[PDB]
Every structure is written in structure tokens, then in C-alpha cells.
Amino acid sequence: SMSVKKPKRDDSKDLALCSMILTEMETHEDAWPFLLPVNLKLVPGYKKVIKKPMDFSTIREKLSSGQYPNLETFALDVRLVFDNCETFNEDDSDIGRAGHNMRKYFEKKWTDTFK
């Protein structure tokens, strides 16, 4: 509350560390469905159904331009990519499997780097 604060967690390396995670997600072999924004002209139903599209290149640009106020807003966008994928793709599809695999990969790096 006013003049009452928990001890200050060092957040000075968060930007660099989120960048390193994102690099590792970018270079994973199952990243291909997620590298670029979904083409809303060419994929029927996407625009109407997925209210907030998100992809790794859009996260990279937001990261590089100071549009994440803290490491939690960064994780929320990464999770959005996978939640969108599950909304639109059957579990038993190459893309559906890719999303599950990447979400796992992310959540481990997240826990190991920060928790």
C-alpha cells in the first residue's frame, strides 16, 4: 500500500531474457504456423472468429519497440498465439499438434528462466 512495498525483484534483465526465449521459439522446427500473421484475406473464417490475432513476428516487433510494460504482458501474447491455434485447429492436425508442442516448450522455458 502507500509507503509499504515488498522487496524490489530485479527486473533489469527481463527484456533481454524475453528476447532470448522468443528467439528459441522462433527457431523451433514446429514454429512455422506461428511465424507470421494469419492472412485474413486468404483464410475463411479467421477474421470473424479470432478476435485478437497474434503471431511471433508481431510479438517481436512489440518487444523491440517497448510495447510490453512488463514480462507478464509478454507471456499473455505468447499464450494468445496458442489459444488462438486451439480455437481454430483440430487437436489431431499438424497445426493443432504444433500448437500444443510449442505451448509446452514455452511454459518450461518460462518457469526455468523466471520461477
From Swiss-Prot:
Tissue: Expressed at varying levels in several tissues, whereas a smaller transcript was expressed specifically in testis.
Subcellular location: Nucleus
Domain Bromo, chain residue ranges per copy: 9-113
Quaternary data: Component of the BRF-1 ISWI chromatin remodeling complex, at least composed of SMARCA1 and BAZ2B, which regulates the spacing of histone octamers on the DNA template to facilitate access to DNA. Within the BRF-1 ISWI chromatin remodeling complex interacts with SMARCA1; the interaction is direct. Component of the BRF-5 ISWI chromatin remodeling complex, at least composed of SMARCA5/SNF2H and BAZ2B, which regulates the spacing of histone octamers on the DNA template to facilitate access to DNA.
Function: Regulatory subunit of the ATP-dependent BRF-1 and BRF-5 ISWI chromatin remodeling complexes, which form ordered nucleosome arrays on chromatin and facilitate access to DNA during DNA-templated processes such as DNA replication, transcription, and repair. Both complexes regulate the spacing of nucleosomes along the chromatin and have the ability to slide mononucleosomes to the center of a DNA template. The BRF-1 ISWI chromatin remodeling complex has a lower ATP hydrolysis rate than the BRF-5 ISWI chromatin remodeling complex.
Family, per entry: Belongs to the WAL family.
UniProt name for this protein: Bromodomain adjacent to zinc finger domain protein 2B
Organism: Homo sapiens
Interval of the full protein contained in this chain: 2054 to 2166 of 2168
